[PDB]
Amino acid sequence: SIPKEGENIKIQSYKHDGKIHRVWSETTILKGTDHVVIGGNDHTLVTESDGRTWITREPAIVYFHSEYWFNVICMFREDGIYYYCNLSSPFVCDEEALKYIDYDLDIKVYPNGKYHLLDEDEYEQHMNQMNYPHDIDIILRRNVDILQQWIEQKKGPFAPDFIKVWKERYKKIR
Ligand SMILES: Nc1nc2c(ncn2[C@@H]2O[C@H](COP(=O)(O)OP(=O)(O)OP(O)(O)=S)[C@@H](O)[C@H]2O)c(=O)[nH]1
Ligand SMILES: [Mg+2]
Ligand SMILES: [Mg+2]
Structure with missing residues (x-):
């Protein structure tokens, strides 16, 4: 269920209790592999x-x-x-959507590259309400560190060459 270049897909964000958090109606696939999905959206509906x-x-x-x-x-x-x-959890894609579990914590990166870690308080409340297992808390804390290291290295989507390639590819197909 690897989405195809040019395919329009829905993106669905769930909480750990299985309830929908957020849905983006239309994203155009720019790259689809077994490990990575890259997409572009513009004037997509978003549902809360x-x-x-x-x-x-x-x-x-x-x-x-x-x-x-x-x-x-x-x-x-x-x-x-x-x-x-x-x-988040890693994603899974099927004929319906690309799907992931949203795990509260988020990171804002400003245009000059500085990052802010968000929703530590929301994470602690939701972790207690929905009873996240100990291994999830360990994985999520580790992945906060990895994500910050990626921002500091300008790796993956934080690479200026990544933005130049995929911004142009998306302008052209749209
Ligand atoms: N694709 C897309 N996503 C956007 C755009 N503007 C905001 N978003 C994203 O939509 C989501 C909802 O925005 P917002 O309500 O500001 O987030 P939030 O308050 O941080 O989200 P929460 O999950 O903790 S309740 C966020 O992931 C935000 O980054 C946009 O123009 N395009
Ligand atoms: Mg949050
Ligand atoms: Mg989030």
């Missing part, structure tokens, strides 16, 4: 857990990994590239 719908106003590139517990949204804003990183 109360059913409310909003529309994205600017393009973004999304990056999904089958072996890391995070995913990344690269947002093209006027003053430059912001990243929003979800601590």
Whole structure:
């Protein structure tokens, strides 16, 4: 169920209790491998857990990994590239959507590369409410460190050459 270049896919974010958190209706696949999915979206519907719908106003590139517990949204804003990183389960794709579990913690990267770790308080409350196993807490804490090391190395989607290649590829196919 590797999505194909040019295919439009839904992206569904769940909580650990199986409830939907967030859904992006339309992302165009730019690359699809056994380990990595890269997509672009622009003016996609977005649905919240109360059913409310909003529309994205600017393009973004999304990056999904089958072996890391995070995913990344690269947002093209006027003053430059912001990243929003979800601590998550790795993804699985089927005919319905690309799917992941959202694990509360997130990392904002500003255009000059500085990062802020978000929702540590929301993580501790949700971990107790939904009873995350000890190994998940260890994996997520480790993947916070890995994600920060990737930002500091400008690796994977944090690479300027990654943005140059995939921003252009998405402008052309859209
Ligand atoms: N693809 C896309 N995603 C966007 C855009 N603007 C914001 N988002 C993403 O949509 C999601 C919801 O935005 P927002 O409500 O600001 O997040 P939040 O409050 O941090 O999210 P939460 O999961 O902790 S309840 C976030 O992942 C955010 O980065 C956009 O233009 N395009
Ligand atoms: Mg999140
Ligand atoms: Mg959060």
